[PDB]
Write an enzyme that holds these catalytic residues in place. Structure first.
Site, short mmCIF file in Angstrom:
data_model
loop_
_atom_site.label_atom_id
_atom_site.label_comp_id
_atom_site.label_asym_id
_atom_site.label_seq_id
_atom_site.Cartn_x
_atom_site.Cartn_y
_atom_site.Cartn_z
N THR A 36 -6.43 6.39 8.16
CA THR A 36 -6.92 6.67 6.82
C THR A 36 -6.86 5.45 5.91
O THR A 36 -7.23 5.56 4.75
CB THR A 36 -6.15 7.81 6.15
N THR A 37 -6.41 4.31 6.42
CA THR A 37 -6.48 3.04 5.71
C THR A 37 -7.25 2.07 6.59
O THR A 37 -7.28 2.22 7.81
CB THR A 37 -5.10 2.43 5.43
N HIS A 91 0.82 -1.20 0.00
CA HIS A 91 0.00 0.00 0.00
C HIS A 91 0.86 1.25 0.00
O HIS A 91 0.57 2.20 -0.73
CB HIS A 91 -0.94 0.01 1.23
N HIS A 96 5.30 6.89 7.10
CA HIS A 96 5.03 6.53 5.72
C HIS A 96 4.47 7.76 5.02
O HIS A 96 4.21 8.79 5.64
CB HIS A 96 4.04 5.37 5.65
N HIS A 98 3.12 10.93 7.18
CA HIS A 98 2.48 10.59 8.44
C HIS A 98 3.48 9.94 9.37
O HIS A 98 3.99 8.85 9.07
CB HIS A 98 1.32 9.62 8.20
N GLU A 115 -3.75 13.50 1.59
CA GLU A 115 -5.01 13.01 2.14
C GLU A 115 -5.80 14.18 2.71
O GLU A 115 -6.92 14.47 2.27
CB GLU A 115 -4.69 11.92 3.17
N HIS A 139 1.75 9.17 1.59
CA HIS A 139 0.74 9.00 0.56
C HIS A 139 1.09 9.97 -0.56
O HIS A 139 1.50 11.10 -0.29
CB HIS A 139 -0.66 9.33 1.11
C1 LIG Z 1 -2.69 0.20 11.42
C2 LIG Z 1 -1.54 0.94 10.89
C3 LIG Z 1 -1.85 2.35 10.42
C4 LIG Z 1 -1.18 3.42 10.99
C5 LIG Z 1 -1.35 4.71 10.52
C6 LIG Z 1 -2.22 4.95 9.47
S1 LIG Z 1 -2.48 6.61 8.90
N1 LIG Z 1 -2.47 6.60 7.27
O1 LIG Z 1 -1.36 7.37 9.39
O2 LIG Z 1 -3.78 6.99 9.34
C7 LIG Z 1 -2.93 3.90 8.90
C8 LIG Z 1 -2.75 2.61 9.39
ZN LIG Z 2 -1.00 7.57 6.41
#
Ligand SMILES: CCc1ccc(S(N)(=O)=O)cc1
Ligand SMILES: [Zn+2]
Ligand SMILES: CCc1ccc(S(N)(=O)=O)cc1
Ligand SMILES: OC[C@H]1O[C@@H](O)[C@H](O)[C@@H](O)[C@@H]1O
Length: 257
Positions: free
Chosen positions: A195-196, A61, A91, A116, A103, A93
């Protein structure tokens, strides 16, 4: 399983993750005129000097840079947060084109990408317990725009060739996440979600106002990653962002007057 394509993307996620239609989903559009300065916010403290990165992983992803979170080293405190939140991973996006990829949006503006930095509340002991709590997580979000190169990002860019496909990882020690921040810590904050999938409603979002600049060449290398595994048909890892979700019964607070 879930992804970002026409057949498994954000508009399908609610079928397996019904919280996708919940009351505190992320991301959101940040209406800068409606956001209100909040004098009750304490100074924000980003304390990353002892961060210990370990590994970088293509999870199909995005890619995650993972940290040792077995002790309080890299932590986030202050601002809207009660207590200490420990960095576990970061990570990004990003888009297929520079005009999309973030996002969160700012007055409907989409940035080229969004970083993030994910942290969990140490009062709950482990990340897994934290994602069973309304205040389990804090995500520091930083927008990326295309312009001058970000020197502190280059080490990330240069390892991506070694994790091109889903399931590949590489050692990634001694990476300093302080090199990914902007000068200013002015921010907006609101309660939201991952957000995932699984889209869990555990997150205090802290979104910095000042973007970082990265070069076109840097973001082009993100776009050479693959969603697919080794030996499978190539699907470029692009447009791995969820669009803005309904604000519902929420207010966005600003740290700055
Ligand atoms: C469960 C791992 C995880 C951690 C952080 C995110 S996010 N894209 O930072 O909301 C999404 C998923
Ligand atoms: Zn994220
Ligand atoms: C096939 C397929 C398509 C979409 C999903 S979901 N609801 O996005 O996890 C799962 C499986
Ligand atoms: O009742 C007045 C209060 O309304 C709330 O919705 C706002 O967040 C506060 O800043 C304001 O003081």
């Amino acid at each position: 399983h879930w992804g970002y394509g026409k057949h498994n993307g954000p508009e399908h996620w609610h079928k397996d993750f019904p919280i996708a239609k919940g009351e505190r989903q992320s991301p959101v559009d940040i209406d800068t005129h409606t956001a209100k300065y909040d004098p009750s916010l304490k100074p924000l403290s980003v304390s990353y000097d002892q961060a210990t990165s370990l590994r970088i992983l293509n999870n199909g992803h995005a890619f995650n840079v993972e940290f040792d979170d077995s002790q309080d080293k890299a932590v986030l405190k202050g601002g809207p947060l009660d207590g200490t939140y420990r960095l576990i991973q970061f990570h990004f996006h990003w888009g297929s084109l520079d005009g999309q990829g973030s996002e969160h949006t700012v007055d409907k503006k989409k940035y080229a990408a969004e970083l993030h930095l994910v942290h969990w509340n140490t009062k709950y002991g482990d990340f897994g317990k934290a994602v069973q709590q309304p205040d389990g997580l804090a995500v520091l979000g930083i927008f990326l725009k295309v312009g001058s190169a970000k020197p502190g990002l280059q080490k990330v860019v240069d390892v991506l060739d070694s994790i091109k496909t889903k399931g590949k990882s590489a050692d990634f020690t001694n990476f300093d996440p302080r090199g990914l921040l902007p000068e200013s810590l002015d921010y907006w904050t609101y309660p939201g979600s991952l957000t995932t999938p699984p889209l869990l409603e555990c997150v205090t979002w802290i979104v910095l106002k000042e973007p970082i600049s990265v070069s076109s060449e840097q973001v082009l290398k993100f776009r050479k990653l693959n969603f697919n595994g080794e030996g499978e048909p190539e699907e470029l890892m692009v447009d791995n962002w969820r669009p803005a979700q309904p604000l519902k019964n929420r207010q966005i607070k600003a740290s700055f007057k």
